[PDB]
């Protein structure tokens, strides 16, 4: 099902054509336009590649490591030059300079779903149907073409654009980067699967759980753990916990679920199959792709771009 349609193929070709015109990426060739956001890993800027005139997203990872480590990081990232999917954020290149790695990617003018959610309050089921399709296909592509899993699915890692595209970013492609990064830390574990938090199972199944959790959060307008109360429910639809406590809850308590009545049973069943604690009982990518919720959503003519622009005010 990784077949690309006409419009998708055209967009990929255009991206590659533009990329080919870009030569070696150099620090001084960039002009900052604005700060897109930050993380405990690095900051992200909307920049302009002066020579090509191309607009890009530049992620700066401040690391005073040896000129050796950074070189291994840059090398491992080179693999993204062949990663071309309508569901994965475009890659321009990477380089080091002034004590910090730079990662240049396709700029997504709609921002991340975490940002979109803040403005929306909550995202409509039909809109989440398109998001689900994109995420599954993105995970499928990474697994198939690059034989890897995302490892960090969450709202802030799902980007969208005025073109109506939905793409994944920040997948674990460079083991060294993950290592160098996973040495320090500061990257939420709140969307990690119970098996990963227990150190038992670690596969694509883990990414499916994270997606299911992200879907619930987006549907109800709040991180769903722990579960809301009748009060919240009636408030949300009319109709604190320290990090370490949260992680234990996830591992020990029953998974979150969507409230009844407000969402179709197909959507509820879909997230339920994603949120089964036992990674073996939890649905897999092939099963999700043919799930009734996905089949229905795929056949729905949803103007995602329109809804998005109206919601964030583009
Ligand atoms: N390619 C991009 N286009 C537009 N915005 C982006 C892009 N990449 C990242 N961002 C924004 O920059 C923010 C910071 O990214 P990041 O450093 O990975 O911290 P986070 O854990 O929130 O993802 C993201 O939350 C997202 O809103
Ligand atoms: N490699 C890598 C990236 C990571 N965030 S590493 C990671 C992943 C999952 C869980 C833990 C860790 N530590 C990353 C960065 N920075 C990128 N893939 S850059 C990138 C490259 C092409 C398109 C979009 C993006 N964000
Ligand atoms: Ca410089
Ligand atoms: Mg991110
Ligand atoms: Na600089």
Swiss-Prot record:
Reaction it catalyzes: L-seryl-[protein] + ATP = O-phospho-L-seryl-[protein] + ADP + H(+); L-threonyl-[protein] + ATP = O-phospho-L-threonyl-[protein] + ADP + H(+); L-tyrosyl-[protein] + ATP = O-phospho-L-tyrosyl-[protein] + ADP + H(+)
Regulation of its activity: Ras proteins such as HRAS mediate the activation of RAF proteins such as RAF1 or BRAF which in turn activate extracellular signal-regulated kinases (ERK) through MAPK (mitogen-activated protein kinases) and ERK kinases MAP2K1/MEK1 and MAP2K2/MEK2. Activation occurs through phosphorylation of Ser-180 and Ser-184. MAP2K1/MEK1 binds KSR1 or KSR2 releasing the inhibitory intramolecular interaction between KSR1 or KSR2 protein kinase and N-terminal domains. This allows KSR1 or KSR2 dimerization with BRAF leading to BRAF activation and phosphorylation of MAP2K1.
GO molecular function list: ATP binding; MAP kinase kinase activity; MAP-kinase scaffold activity; mitogen-activated protein kinase kinase kinase binding; protein kinase activator activity; protein kinase activity; protein serine kinase activity; protein serine/threonine kinase activator activity
Source organism phylogeny: Eukaryota, Metazoa, Chordata, Craniata, Vertebrata
Gene Ontology biological process terms, A to Z: Bergmann glial cell differentiation; cell motility; cellular senescence; central nervous system neuron differentiation; cerebellar cortex formation; chemotaxis; endodermal cell differentiation; epithelial cell proliferation involved in lung morphogenesis
Disulfide bonds: none
Keyword ATP-binding: yes
Reported disease: Cardiofaciocutaneous syndrome 3: A form of cardiofaciocutaneous syndrome, a multiple congenital anomaly disorder characterized by a distinctive facial appearance, heart defects and intellectual disability. Heart defects include pulmonic stenosis, atrial septal defects and hypertrophic cardiomyopathy. Some affected individuals present with ectodermal abnormalities such as sparse, friable hair, hyperkeratotic skin lesions and a generalized ichthyosis-like condition. Typical facial features are similar to Noonan syndrome.
Outcome recorded upon mutating residue 18 to P: In MEL; somatic mutation
Reported tissue expression: Widely expressed, with extremely low levels in brain.
Active site annotation, chain numbering: 152 (proton acceptor)
A Gene Ontology cellular-component term: nucleus
Chain positions recorded as U0126 binding sites: 59, 170-173
Enzyme Commission number(s): 2.7.12.2
Binding-site residues, ATP: 36-44, 59, 105-108, 112-115, 154-157, 170
Gene: MAP2K1
Protein's name according to its UniProt entry: Dual specificity mitogen-activated protein kinase kinase 1
InterPro entries: Kinase-like_dom_sf, MAP_kinase_kinase, Prot_kinase_dom, Protein_kinase_ATP_BS, Ser/Thr_kinase_AS
Documented effect of changing residue 112 to A: No loss of activity
Residues that bear Phosphoserine: 180, 184
Membrane topology listed for this record: Peripheral membrane protein
Subcellular compartments: Cytoplasm, Cytoskeleton, Microtubule organizing center, Centrosome; Cytoplasm, Cytoskeleton, Microtubule organizing center, Spindle pole body; Cytoplasm; Nucleus
Keyword list, A-Z: Acetylation, ATP-binding, Cardiomyopathy, Cytoplasm, Cytoskeleton, Disease variant, Ectodermal dysplasia, Intellectual disability, Kinase, Membrane, Nucleotide-binding, Nucleus, Phosphoprotein, Serine/threonine-protein kinase, Transferase, Tyrosine-protein kinase
Binding-site residues for K-252a, renumbered to this chain: 106-108, 156
Mutagenesis / variant outcome for changing residue 244 to S: Loss of interaction with BRAF and KSR1. Loss of BRAF-KSR1 dimerization
């Amino acid at each position: 099902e990784l077949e690309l349609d006409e419009q998708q193929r055209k967009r990929l070709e255009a991206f590659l054509t533009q990329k080919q015109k870009v030569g070696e990426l150099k620090d001084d060739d960039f002009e900052k336009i604005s700060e897109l956001g930050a993380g405990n890993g690095g900051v992200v800027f909307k920049v302009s590649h002066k020579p090509s005139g191309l607009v890009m997203a530049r992620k700066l990872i401040h690391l005073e490591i040896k000129p050796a480590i950074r070189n291994q990081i840059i090398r491992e990232l080179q693999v993204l030059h062949e990663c071309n999917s309508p569901y994965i954020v475009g890659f321009y290149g990477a380089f080091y300079s002034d004590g910090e790695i730079s990662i240049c990617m396709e700029h997504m003018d709609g921002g991340s779903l975490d940002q979109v959610l803040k403005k929306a309050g909550r995202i409509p089921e039909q809109i989440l149907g398109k998001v689900s399709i994109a995420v599954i296909k993105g995970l499928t592509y990474l697994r198939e073409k690059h034989k890897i899993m995302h490892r960090d699915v969450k709202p802030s890692n799902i980007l969208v654009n005025s073109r109506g595209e939905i793409k994944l970013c920040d997948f674990g492609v460079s083991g060294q980067l993950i290592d160098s990064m996973a040495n320090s830390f500061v990257g939420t574990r709140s969307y990690m699967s119970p098996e990963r938090l227990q150190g038992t199972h670690y596969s694509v199944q883990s990414d499916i759980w994270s997606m299911g959790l992200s879907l619930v959060e987006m549907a109800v307008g709040r991180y769903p753990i722990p579960p809301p109360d009748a009060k919240e429910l009636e408030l949300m639809f009319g109709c604190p916990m320290a990090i370490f406590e949260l992680l234990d809850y996830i591992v020990n308590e029953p998974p979150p679920k969507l409230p009844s009545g407000v969402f179709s049973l197909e959507f509820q069943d879909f997230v339920n199959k994603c949120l089964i604690k036992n990674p073996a009982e939890r649905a897999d990518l092939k099963q999700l792709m043919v799930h009734a919720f996905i089949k229905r959503s795929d056949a729905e003519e949803v103007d995602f771009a329109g809804w998005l622009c109206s919601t964030i005010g583009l």
